[PDB]
Amino acid sequence: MNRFFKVSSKYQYYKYLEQYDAAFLRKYQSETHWYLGRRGAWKNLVIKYAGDHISLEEEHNVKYKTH
Amino acid sequence: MEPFGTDERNWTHEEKDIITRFLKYDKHVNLKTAEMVYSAEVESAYFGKAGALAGGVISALFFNFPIVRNLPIIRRSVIGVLPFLYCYTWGKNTQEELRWLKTFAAYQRFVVYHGQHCKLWV
Amino acid sequence: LFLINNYKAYKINTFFLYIYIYLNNLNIIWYPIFKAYSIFGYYKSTRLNFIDTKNENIKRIKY
Amino acid sequence: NYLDQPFVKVPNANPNASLNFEEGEVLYENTRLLEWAKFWNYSVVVGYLWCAYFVPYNIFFKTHMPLEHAYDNLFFPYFQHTHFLWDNNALHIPTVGG
Amino acid sequence: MIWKYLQRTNRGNIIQAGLQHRKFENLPFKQNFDNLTKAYDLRMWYISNSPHEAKNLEYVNELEALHNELNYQNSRQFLFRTVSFLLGWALFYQFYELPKTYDWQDTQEPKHQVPAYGDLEEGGD
Amino acid sequence: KGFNLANAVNTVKSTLNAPIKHIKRNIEPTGSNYS
Amino acid sequence: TVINSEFLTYLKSNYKISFSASNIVKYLSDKSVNNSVILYLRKNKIFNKS
Amino acid sequence: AHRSNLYQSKDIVGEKSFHEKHLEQQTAPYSGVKSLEEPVSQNKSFINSLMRAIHNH
Amino acid sequence: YSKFTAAIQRFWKRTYIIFWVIEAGTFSVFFYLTLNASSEPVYMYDQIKIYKTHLFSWRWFLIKLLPSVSIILLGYYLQLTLKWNLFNKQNTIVLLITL
Amino acid sequence: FETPSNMVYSMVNPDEHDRLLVDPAYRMERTKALEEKYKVYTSSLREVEKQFEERYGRAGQINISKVTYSTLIDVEKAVLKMDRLFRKVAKFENRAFIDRANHSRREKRMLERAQQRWDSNYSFFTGSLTEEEQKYRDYYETELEAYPEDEGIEQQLDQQEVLLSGRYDPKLYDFQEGYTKNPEDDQTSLIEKKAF
Amino acid sequence: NIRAHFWSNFALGLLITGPIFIIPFGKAFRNLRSGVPYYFRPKYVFTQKNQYN
Amino acid sequence: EVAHLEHLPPSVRSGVKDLSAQDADGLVDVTCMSSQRSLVFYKGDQYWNPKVYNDFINQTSNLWTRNYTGYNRLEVQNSVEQVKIGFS
Amino acid sequence: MDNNYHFWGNGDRQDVSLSYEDYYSILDCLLDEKLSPQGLMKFKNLHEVSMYGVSYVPLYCFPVAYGISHMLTGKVRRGHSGYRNLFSLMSVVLPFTCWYAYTTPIPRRLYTEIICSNNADGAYVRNRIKQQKPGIWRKLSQQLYNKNFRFPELNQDLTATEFPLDYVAPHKF
Numbered sequence A: 001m002n003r004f005f006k007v008s009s010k011y012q013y014y015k016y017l018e019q020y021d022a023a024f025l026r027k028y029q030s031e032t033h034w035y036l037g038r039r040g041a042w043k044n045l046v047i048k049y050a051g052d053h054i055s056l057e058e059e060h061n062v063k064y065k066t067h
Numbered sequence B: 001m002e003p004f005g006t007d008e009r010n011w012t013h014e015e016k017d018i019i020t021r022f023l024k025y026d027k028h029v030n031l032k033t034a035e036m037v038y039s040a041e042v043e044s045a046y047f048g049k050a051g052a053l054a055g056g057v058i059s060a061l062f063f064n065f066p067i068v069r070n071l072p073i074i075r076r077s078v079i080g081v082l083p084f085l086y087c088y089t090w091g092k093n094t095q096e097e098l099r100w101l102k103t104f105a106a107y108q109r110f111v112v113y114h115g116q117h118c119k120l121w122v
Numbered sequence C: 001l002f003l004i005n006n007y008k009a010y011k012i013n014t015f016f017l018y019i020y021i022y023l024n025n026l027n028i029i030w031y032p033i034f035k036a037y038s039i040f041g042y043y044k045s046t047r048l049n050f051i052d053t054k055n056e057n058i059k060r061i062k063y
Numbered sequence D: 001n002y003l004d005q006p007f008v009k010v011p012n013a014n015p016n017a018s019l020n021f022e023e024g025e026v027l028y029e030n031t032r033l034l035e036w037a038k039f040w041n042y043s044v045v046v047g048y049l050w051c052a053y054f055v056p057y058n059i060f061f062k063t064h065m066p067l068e069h070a071y072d073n074l075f076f077p078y079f080q081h082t083h084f085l086w087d088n089n090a091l092h093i094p095t096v097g098g
Numbered sequence E: 001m002i003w004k005y006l007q008r009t010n011r012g013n014i015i016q017a018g019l020q021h022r023k024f025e026n027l028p029f030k031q032n033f034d035n036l037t038k039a040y041d042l043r044m045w046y047i048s049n050s051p052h053e054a055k056n057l058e059y060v061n062e063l064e065a066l067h068n069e070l071n072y073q074n075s076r077q078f079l080f081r082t083v084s085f086l087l088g089w090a091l092f093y094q095f096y097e098l099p100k101t102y103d104w105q106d107t108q109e110p111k112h113q114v115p116a117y118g119d120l121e122e123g124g125d
Numbered sequence F: 001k002g003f004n005l006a007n008a009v010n011t012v013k014s015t016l017n018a019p020i021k022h023i024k025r026n027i028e029p030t031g032s033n034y035s
Numbered sequence G: 001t002v003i004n005s006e007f008l009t010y011l012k013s014n015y016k017i018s019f020s021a022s023n024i025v026k027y028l029s030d031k032s033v034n035n036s037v038i039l040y041l042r043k044n045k046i047f048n049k050s
Numbered sequence H: 001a002h003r004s005n006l007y008q009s010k011d012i013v014g015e016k017s018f019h020e021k022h023l024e025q026q027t028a029p030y031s032g033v034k035s036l037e038e039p040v041s042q043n044k045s046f047i048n049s050l051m052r053a054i055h056n057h
Numbered sequence I: 001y002s003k004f005t006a007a008i009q010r011f012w013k014r015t016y017i018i019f020w021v022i023e024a025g026t027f028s029v030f031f032y033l034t035l036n037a038s039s040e041p042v043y044m045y046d047q048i049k050i051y052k053t054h055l056f057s058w059r060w061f062l063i064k065l066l067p068s069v070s071i072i073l074l075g076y077y078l079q080l081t082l083k084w085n086l087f088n089k090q091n092t093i094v095l096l097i098t099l
Numbered sequence J: 001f002e003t004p005s006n007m008v009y010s011m012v013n014p015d016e017h018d019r020l021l022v023d024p025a026y027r028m029e030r031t032k033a034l035e036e037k038y039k040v041y042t043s044s045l046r047e048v049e050k051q052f053e054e055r056y057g058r059a060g061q062i063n064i065s066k067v068t069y070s071t072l073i074d075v076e077k078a079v080l081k082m083d084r085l086f087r088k089v090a091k092f093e094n095r096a097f098i099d100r101a102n103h104s105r106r107e108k109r110m111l112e113r114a115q116q117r118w119d120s121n122y123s124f125f126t127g128s129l130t131e132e133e134q135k136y137r138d139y140y141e142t143e144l145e146a147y148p149e150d151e152g153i154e155q156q157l158d159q160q161e162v163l164l165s166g167r168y169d170p171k172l173y174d175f176q177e178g179y180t181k182n183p184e185d186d187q188t189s190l191i192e193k194k195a196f
Numbered sequence K: 001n002i003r004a005h006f007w008s009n010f011a012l013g014l015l016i017t018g019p020i021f022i023i024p025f026g027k028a029f030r031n032l033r034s035g036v037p038y039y040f041r042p043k044y045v046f047t048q049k050n051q052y053n
Numbered sequence L: 001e002v003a004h005l006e007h008l009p010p011s012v013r014s015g016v017k018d019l020s021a022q023d024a025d026g027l028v029d030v031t032c033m034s035s036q037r038s039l040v041f042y043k044g045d046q047y048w049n050p051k052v053y054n055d056f057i058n059q060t061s062n063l064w065t066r067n068y069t070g071y072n073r074l075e076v077q078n079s080v081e082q083v084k085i086g087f088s
Numbered sequence M: 001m002d003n004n005y006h007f008w009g010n011g012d013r014q015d016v017s018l019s020y021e022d023y024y025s026i027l028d029c030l031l032d033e034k035l036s037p038q039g040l041m042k043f044k045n046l047h048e049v050s051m052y053g054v055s056y057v058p059l060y061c062f063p064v065a066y067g068i069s070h071m072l073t074g075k076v077r078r079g080h081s082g083y084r085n086l087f088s089l090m091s092v093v094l095p096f097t098c099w100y101a102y103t104t105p106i107p108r109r110l111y112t113e114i115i116c117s118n119n120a121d122g123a124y125v126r127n128r129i130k131q132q133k134p135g136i137w138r139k140l141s142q143q144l145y146n147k148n149f150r151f152p153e154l155n156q157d158l159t160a161t162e163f164p165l166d167y168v169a170p171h172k173f
Helices: A013-019 A022-029 A042-052 B013-025 B031-062 B073-113 C002-006 C011-024 C038-045 D032-061 D092-097 E033-049 E053-095 F005-017 F020-027 G005-014 H018-026 H046-055 I006-035 I058-064 I066-083 I087-098 J014-022 J024-056 J066-093 J103-118 J131-139 J151-164 J190-195 K002-016 K018-029 L050-060 M020-027 M037-073 M083-102 M109-116 M120-132 M134-146
Strands: G037-042 J007-012 J062-064 J173-175 L027-032 L037-042
Touching: A013 J024, A022 G037, A022 J024, A042 J014, B013 B031, B013 B073, B031 B073, B031 D032, B073 D032, C038 E053, E033 E053, E033 J066, E053 I066, E053 M037, E053 M083, F005 H018, F020 I087, F020 L027, G037 J014, G037 J024, I058 M083, I066 I087, I066 M083, J007 J014, J007 J024, J014 J024, J062 J066, J066 J131, J066 J151, J066 J173, J103 J131, K002 K018, M020 M037, M020 M134, M037 M083, M037 M109, M037 M120, M109 M120, M109 M134, M120 M134
Parallel strands: G037 J007, J062 J173
Antiparallel strands: L027 L037
């Protein structure tokens, strides 16, 4: 178990990393979870809310509706 | 009239020139075939000059390109003249191809006109 | 067999045998499982001979 | 409406007030990449132009004689093409533009 | 006589084949396609013939990992071989002198190029 | 003090070996497993 | 995992194992347990019945 | 201060440009064929002397 | 998110195959008509159609085929390496296929 | 592609799922807690199965061939050997990233030894040793001086581990001639049975 | 007449192609190219190969 | 944010040999994990500042550890921390 | 060896060898009015044998194309799953193997009877190939002279008082 040695940031939140093994973080912050590791997935929630509502059905592209 | 097959010799430059000057000036050739060769000569001539000129302009721009402009003179010159060589070759090849395709069409028309192809009759 | 044994330590014969061996193992081919079940489904397909020797298949009446 | 998340808060648009953006030590510097970038980008564009507009324009509008790859697989007799006796309702203009 | 080598079946054709120990002795110090395939085959044969479930499930996990790694190795092989094939194809046709001296009779139809029934295609008698 | 073929060959080798790192980086597998 | 001897004795005295486990997890070794990936499934109210 | 460093970091050594590498290569001394300049009598021939001159200038 | 179930994926696979089957019907009829194309009688009207085999050289066809097989192989490589590659690293393959 | 089978699904409430998505620290904490729970649950199931087997005994013997028995043991040993080889290869490949502090010195030692052995000399390897493995030994000198994964000793220990695992106890197997259509016992000669 | 001869030869061929070619060909399915004995690779149907070989 | 930058090992363990970073002049790809972006550096000492380079390398190399290769006969017992049950 | 050496569509090693491409090109430069009823019979038998042969050649080349296409994909056999790449590479490679096969001369009794017959039909065919197919006749003349055939139409004719009509490739006198 190669534990996360030290987080040099002054943000006390990032201190959570020191508790876990390198393999544990590698499994849940990389490989399968690469598109999710160490990121606050608020955009997933926003885009889900965009998709599931009865919005305007005239879509120009992914980002914008039709003018 | 020409031999046909995979093993046969392709048309050489001398043969193409001789056939072109035969179709242009000889009798036994209808006016339409000669006019076809003349129109081949007129329209094809633009492409050699156009390719050479476009290559010259592109090479002048390329001689001062962001990486080319900071190369030693020998490498800079070679890289700068590469677009000119490419476009000049394109122009010459396009001119030759257009002219010879139209000339060969005229030659086929002449051969059919004088019935000089076996397995071809009205 | 005596002749073959006699010409076993020769470098030329050993070189020919080495070339033969190298050509033999040159082409090793992998056969994947291309069904959506993949490894676990195939593994569960190969359990017939050993299911009856398992504790959940022992006769054990509730009453 | 979609930013009004009911259980969590979306991140603030501005950076956290604890962060300090004053310049510090330079770590890595490979500036020549920019030049390379320019070069490649410009090259591609130039090539793109030559391969997409100049050559098609010259072999479509500046001549009537076809090239070999236009009819080598066909068994029509030889003929020339004109830009004006085709596509009366111009559906090729929006297609080319797009 | 004849039945000894015509009717008496050989031993090997009946019993299950054993592991070829020659092919696992001197292995290259690499995680190459050969070694990965050997490991995959070993674990697949084991889970196909083993009554032990703990080792079987461990080998199932390791087999999935080996499948991913072998997919990567095959992607490298496919890229290199197909790029070489395409470049060789292009170079061959760049240097090959294409025969352009084939017969052109198919493009010529004198009865149709100059319609032999001219002035009669429209009903006239 | 002039053209030399050894320097030219070295420059050609450097030109050929320059794009190797970028092609290898493109072929590199990332730390992503898109199952 | 280590289970205390006193706790095991308490379990054995209070509960007598009379039936087998139908869960296939019982065959997993500790090597295979450590290789598992914990995925999450949001469980909310269901309105679509198809 | 930035212009005095020509808009590059003072702490980074940097990579030599095409011109600098070219000049570094072109000013390298030419060490000719050293086997020709030996006290061996075989180098006293006219052909050997001609080759020595034309190579070790 | 939250819409692409297994039923939807199967629906879109079916939609793809249905569209390509529909487009392959009229083309099939045209190809069948092309095979047994109408012609004049061989005896006096059309004595030359015996020699009009309309055979095109295979060498020219083979040199024609290169870009299509190239994009097929590049697309397969793009789809296989999507397991362990990112979007910016695959933009090279995507741009090559586009060109 | 392959379908992984190491996924354990845990249900969460929508509020907790939102917090998991937007809070990586909470996500890691809950994930490690659930992994501990999975370990506990698996151990509990294993203990229950042990108690059941003790109370009621085995379901029955396994009809296997002696050839298949020997091949299973050989496959296990070969798998262990290849895992050890892959471990060594990975340690050598990832040398520049695992330990970046000593990489320069270890690489200098490895390269100088390799140059010495392959310059003005011919390196003659015997057995399974290769140039790559010798470079691996040169790089990890200090590590291999502590616990050398010696191939012969590790193979002996692998065989001992395989045989002591308890899976291959002959009392668990009813050895048979598998090829025969009717189930018949093992009919190898008496001396062959003694050698087995 | 020809037909009869042919069929005789056909039958004879089967005999002569029994031990000389096909059985030695079947000697190649004992092990794979990696040395591991033959095992089942299923295409679509995961048939249970419970019997011996 | 430097806290989010990591030099992640490849997902395919056999592909470490086929990396640019194996070369002395290759490329080093550092992933920003809070945005899943890539920073490609040239691993030549002339492009780096020695006063901060070692600190950056130490801070970004935390998930490329020895477990990536595997556990030998001795480290497998320490691969996890035992869960003690019933000790109260 | 074989029990069907009488068959007209059969041949031995030292028979006149013509590839299918050469045979079709030769057919393209002949007239049926100039041939006796025996020569027409030879050509018709050759036609049926050759139609079956040209039908079968891709079947002969399929194993080699299959192997080469498999080796181009890699060392993985994804049966029923790599069919798309396998058959794209097949549609590319099988034409190449068929190119090598169709450009390969094959010996036949009908080939050696049509070309090397000493009657008027043989002379007509030889001269027609000599004039209308100079390259085919160049190769064929080399082959015939190598096989101890002595005809006036051969370029390698030491008894002729007229110069050869083509380049005489080097050969052992």
